Amino acid sequence: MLKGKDGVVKNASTGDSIGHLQSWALDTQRDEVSGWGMGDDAERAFTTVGRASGNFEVYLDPADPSDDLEPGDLVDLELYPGGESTGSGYRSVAGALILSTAESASKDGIPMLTVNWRTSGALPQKATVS
Amino acid sequence: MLKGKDGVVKNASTGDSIGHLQSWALDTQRDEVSGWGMGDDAERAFTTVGRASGNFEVYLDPADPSDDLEPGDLVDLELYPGGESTGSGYRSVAGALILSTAESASKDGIPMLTVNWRTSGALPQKATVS
Amino acid sequence: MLKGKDGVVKNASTGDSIGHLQSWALDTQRDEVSGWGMGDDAERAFTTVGRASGNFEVYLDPADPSDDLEPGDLVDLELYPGGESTGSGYRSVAGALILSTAESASKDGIPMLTVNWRTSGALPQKATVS
Amino acid sequence: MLKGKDGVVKNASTGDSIGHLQSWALDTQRDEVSGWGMGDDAERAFTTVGRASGNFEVYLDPADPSDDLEPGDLVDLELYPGGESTGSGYRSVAGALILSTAESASKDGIPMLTVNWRTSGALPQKATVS
Amino acid sequence: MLKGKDGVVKNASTGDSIGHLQSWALDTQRDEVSGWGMGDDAERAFTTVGRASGNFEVYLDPADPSDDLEPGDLVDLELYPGGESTGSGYRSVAGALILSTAESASKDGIPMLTVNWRTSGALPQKATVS
Amino acid sequence: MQFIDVEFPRDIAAGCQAVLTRRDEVVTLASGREEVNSRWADTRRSWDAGLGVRDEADLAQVVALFEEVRGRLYAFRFRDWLDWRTAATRAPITATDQPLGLGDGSRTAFQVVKVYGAVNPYTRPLSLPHPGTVRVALDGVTQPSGWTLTAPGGVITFDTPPALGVTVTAGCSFDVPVRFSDPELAVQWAYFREGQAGLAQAPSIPLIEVRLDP
Amino acid sequence: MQFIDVEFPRDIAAGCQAVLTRRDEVVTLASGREEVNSRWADTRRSWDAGLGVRDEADLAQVVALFEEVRGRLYAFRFRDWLDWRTAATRAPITATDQPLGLGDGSRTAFQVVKVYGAVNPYTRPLSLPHPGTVRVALDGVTQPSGWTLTAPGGVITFDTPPALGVTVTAGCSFDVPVRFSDPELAVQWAYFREGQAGLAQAPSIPLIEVRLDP
Amino acid sequence: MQFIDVEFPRDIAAGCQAVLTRRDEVVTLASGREEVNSRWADTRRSWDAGLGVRDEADLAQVVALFEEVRGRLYAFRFRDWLDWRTAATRAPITATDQPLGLGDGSRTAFQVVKVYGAVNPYTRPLSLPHPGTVRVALDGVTQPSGWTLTAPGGVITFDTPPALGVTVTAGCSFDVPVRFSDPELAVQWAYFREGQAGLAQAPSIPLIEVRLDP
Amino acid sequence: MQFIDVEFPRDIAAGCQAVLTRRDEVVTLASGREEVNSRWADTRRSWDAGLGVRDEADLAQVVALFEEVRGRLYAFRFRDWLDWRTAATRAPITATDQPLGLGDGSRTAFQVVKVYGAVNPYTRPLSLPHPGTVRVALDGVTQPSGWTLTAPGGVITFDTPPALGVTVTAGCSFDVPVRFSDPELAVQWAYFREGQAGLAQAPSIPLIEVRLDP
């Protein structure tokens, strides 16, 4: 358990936080192959390829690093779930490729930037900030 | 984080705002291909072509620029999330085809116009109006 | 923006309102084709076919024009979003073909008629009532 | 609009109402085929087959005509949305096939019988009982 | 019924509980094949392969056994729904294969670790710990 | 010949295909000219079985049965659901339902004959009347004893030939003779044991209704 | 020859497909050696039709029309959308848009010619100018009367031949000649009456643009 | 030969797929000893094109180009992006990137060659070097001029032959002669008119990079 | 012969398929009569490659590499993951893992041999031991210097022949010889530039493990 309010999702490559973030998502998915035979009662599963996808939500601003970020940008992310406080688990995403950005708001609504990224064949490293 | 009330969709071609808008939506998506030689831990991903779409909601009116707009119209759009104020980020969309218009209401409900656009052969430019 | 309570959905052929009516829906949809390019960033949009589908909700009554309107009836619709009040934009649907009617009610619920229509190769005309 | 309390599903074949009934549903659907030449603004639509289905909700009881009714029974139905009162529109269904019966309840819940019928090779006639 | 507070997912392999856990899930499924001769009232059904999957929700922490756990790890699990108390039913999972870990949080939200496992080539044994 | 009568299980028969096989066409010039060749004695039926096996043990039973004939030795008894009823699937077959013929005072023997069609009906003699569904009727009264039914023959012989003017009507279930079209049989059984499977639909078992030359 | 001019409805043409047929290749040894065989007068266009019928009554009309020619007697008039516009689908065709040629003082007759390509253009004479889209132009001024257009010929004859130095420019819609590739017609009509259907498209109605031999 | 110079538009070239065919094989016995017999003309590239037309009007321009060639008179130029860069698609193409060879003091002419490999590179002579991307560098310094490129030839001729032991490095875009495999041209145009369209891509057009026989 | 050793990249090999090719059948009459023809020296392995290319630049590299051999000149070096490990994919290969043989006091040279099967094993000599994975062992102790490994030969020669009673055990990664089955190569690269694609997999690049005749 960590707070997450203090958590900083910051660009590894730029070195700075994207903006007024609302949320951060990181999922590492490993696909598996399950095999069974009719003379065998159970299926054995072996994990194959692993890929990482994530979305970070920000408030859209003209003066925003997130605004600078664009779909199709390959950028590394120094995500700190527990923030920059030392010893917090932090994910050093490497070469995440931004897939899409959403900028939708109602008249009442505050403009929001939804940035979705998927990995480029690299795996985020769960290092501890020191 | 803009107010969003300031955000106004203006039809660039008309030179005036479409109407009493309820909401504005812009999404930019770049599609990607991921491929891995078998036995690879992760799949290398490369972004391919990029295309974008957006939807703006308006209140249906006989005297509305949005009413004048029709499905299948390739129309330039000038979303102004920051508004027309100096140093306000705005999205300029060129030749955005209007996919469809929906006019629906309940007796209690005010007539509602829903207009959706997909830019044709172009990517929206996040220009700054100052 | 119009009120819609005053709005009258009336048959263009019979010339009279369908019945007590909860809601009216009109959507004009134009299908489009993407101009995909490999080695090219964006795809142009070409609109090929436009068709109109709509559903009007009525309260089922034995003495109802809506009851008279069976599924499979090709009937023109004079839809007034702002009502018959002069100057209200109105849709002169032509040759709408009724697709289905649902007469469903709970013991508590008043009998309801949901009438859905789709066009027969004609496009509703957004005329203004004089 | 009627009341819905008045509405009663009576099994025509039994000559008596199915039982305490939570709700009654009737839907009449006429499907259509839409075809257009490639150079066509809109697609001409022609209705093909009309078929209807309905579902009535009952409270499960050992002494219920609905309990006696079984899935796979082609049974005539006499929905009476206006009731049996004079000048009440009612739907006479002939040979409606009972697709399935669901008997389910929670400890708190009273046993519930859900019976669904699709008239076979016939369309319900909206006769008036006077 | 037990309490669920008592229920704890303990990694059998590490000999310790994964962490502060929001929830624990175990599902055991035995698939079946049903076949009928064309002139058959009902279809005879025979069970085939049996496989199980489970998901445990934890709060993400740098000092967590769950954090140490990775997708693609074939790790034995010792769910203890009754707890470690005498005469408590518990599920011993053998070689459960972690499929994915979701690390996601909002600024308000505490970082969450969601870990899902599917036992490979084995079915969890519902042993009793006393 | 004597042939063999071996029952095909009805449950296996439940999962069986039906296709009408008819011959005698060979037309002439395609100038709109048509000539009717006559093959003679046609109207056989085509079936594919094994879809009614249900489980491995039953599948074994049919396979053993195919082995019994060692490749369709002589005749094989097949239950035909379509021809089983001389009346309707929902209507009971009766002696009156199918008309065998009229006794002439010398007509001791009548083969069970299924008349299909009306103005120019084709009549099919039935080799095996299913036992116990065979009822003989005479115009005056349903006929009981004194009719000798040859089960292999399909012929019912009145000991005293019916006099002129009494209609012989007999309706019975049809145990049709069948000869398998192909010696090869596909086996879909689904391995059992730990898997504990078994298969309801063995495929590619082909049989042809056979009008045996007597 | 005289041929026949029978219109193909534009709505049916909307359904119709377009393909380009070109010949004259037959190259030499595949050692990288290439020889250009010349078939001569090629560039026909392949089409498949009947997909624009929309409804049964219209389908009947085209079918009757095919019957009228009794198998492509002589020529058949086909509306080609691609060749209809000398200019563009969104741009109006003009006399100036297509250049017929230059009068030499003896050049009374000019066939409407469609020039395709630039450096080495192939010119296609048009058998049938669509009526009313035919406009004649001269370098000095658009030309009105005195040009005799042979609609079957596709030739426009100035009564007084244009003198040297005046460009004849004519742009018109193309009513191309067509001969059906296959006698067989596939009928997809969808039963009407109680069914009340009718079919938008009828498949398998191939036609080939035909360069009629004069 | 001089051939016909018609450029395949890069936009039309957008999206095409290619296959590489080698003509050297002719192996021997199953002993495991195989003999490679080469008849030359190896590694030709076969191309399926017509992709990225976008609209029928644009498609018409490609069709006009096909008409201009008239069954591929001579040869037709095709621009290949893969060979256009001497280095890598992202990387800049430079004179230094491709080394033509070393002068002997008499070597006025250097063919532009793409060396496919390291140990035994298969050299692809460039018949057509795209103009203005040609950069020539002598060992001492980049050469502004005096190298006479023959555009049809693909040969650059130094007026003064480079001295012995002088490296010549030249990098340029690659234009390759292509002859269409099939005379017929498949067309995907998408009908316009009321249902306005214009197909994004035409169907594959077979055009083959051909190493012309000398 | 001398042949050629050219490495096939492991990443491209990652995409590559594996199939087992075995011969020596040709049995006699199908009455259950069986005769074993011996083709001799079989057990080649079939592969299809190019699916591991990942990107355009790498795809170019393999293509250039295929061009380098100009159609499989002599031998080609293929990295086989399956044969790479004398032990297991999860278990390290050791000299002890594979038994070369036993020295007789005159046995200076031992070819690396992979024994497959137990009661009647087939032994495959390996043409190219992967460098640095070659370890020699003797029953008394792992053997270091004095063994001369002929990398092309696959033969390890002890300068002093091992005396009778010492087992020579050597386990090494297998750089198997390969000859491409088909000269034709399918190129799937996905257009780059503005599209910026590139392709992970290229289909149709078959190769056959080749037992070279020495």
Numbering used by the authors:
A (entry chain B), B (entry chain A), C (entry chain F), D (entry chain E), E (entry chain C): 1 to 130
F (entry chain H), G (entry chain L), H (entry chain K), I (entry chain J): 1 to 214
Cite, word for word, the article reporting this structure.
We recently characterized a novel roseophage, vB_DshS-R4C (R4C), that could infect the Dinoroseobacter shibae DFL12T, a ubiquitous group of Gram-negative α-proteobacteria of the Roseobacter clade. Here, we report the atomic capsid and in-situ structures of the tail machine of the marine siphophage, vB_DshS-R4C (R4C), which infects Roseobacter. The R4C virion, comprising 12 distinct structural protein components, has a unique five-fold vertex of the icosahedral capsid that allows genome delivery. In this study, we use cryo-electron microscopy (cryo-EM) and structure prediction to determine the atomic structure of the phage R4C capsid and the in-situ structure of the tail machinery to characterize the distinguished long rigid tail.
The distal ends of the R4C tails were re-extracted and resolved by imposing C3 symmetry, resulting in a 4.5-Å structure containing a C6 distal tail (Dit), a C3 baseplate module, and three C3 tail fibre trimers. Below the Dit is the baseplate, consisting of 3 hub proteins (vBDshSR4C_014), 3 megatron proteins (vBDshSR4C_016) and 9 fibre proteins (vBDshSR4C_017). The R4C distal tail—attaching the tail tube upward and the baseplate downward—is a C6 hexamer, as revealed by C3 reconstruction. Short loops from two adjacent monomers, and the α1 and β2-α2 loops interact with the long loop of a tail tube monomer. The Dit long loop adopts an L-shaped β-hairpin belt to create a flexible surface for optimal binding of the baseplate, mediating symmetry mismatch between the C6 Dit hexamer and the C3 megatron-hub complex. The overall R4C baseplate is homologous to that of RcGTA and both comprise hub (35.5% sequence identity), megatron (39.6% sequence identity), and fibre (30.4% sequence identity) proteins. The ion-binding domain, which comprises two discrete segments, uses four conserved Cys residues to coordinate an iron-sulfur cluster, which is essential for tail assembly and phage biological activity. The megatron protein is divided into six domains: iris/penetration (1–45), adhesion-like (46–211), peripheral, carbohydrate-binding (482–629), central (904–1130) and fibre-binding domains (1131–1447). The three α1 helices from the three megatron proteins form an iris-like gate in a closed state (inner diameter, ~10 Å) that resembles that of RcGTA36; this structure aids in preventing the eruption of genomic DNA. Each of the three tripod-like trimeric fibre complexes is formed by a combination of three tail fibre monomers, in which the head (1–35), body (36–117), and foot (118–230) regions are referred to as the rod, knob, and foot domains, respectively. Accordingly, the R4C phage equips various carbohydrate-binding accessories, including the Dit insertion domain, the megatron carbohydrate-binding and peripheral domains, the hub oligosaccharide-binding domain and the fibre foot domain to attach to the bacteria capsule.
